Design a protein around this ligand. Sequence first.
Ligand SMILES: [Zn+2]
Length: 62
Amino acid sequence: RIETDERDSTNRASFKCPVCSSTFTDLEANQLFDPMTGTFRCTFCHTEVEEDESAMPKKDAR
Ligand SMILES: [Zn+2]
């Protein structure tokens, strides 16, 4: 048959906060990033965020 999966997500540009469960994309990475730690820090609960592998619109089971 035909292949549906091919691009969709790339690797980053989709981080999420482990404390207030918030979320951010790449446009927010250049602003949530911090040199004092070398990572992206939340913006409301200043908690360390982490790339979210489940924050994009997938097939969600057709
Ligand atoms: Zn937070």
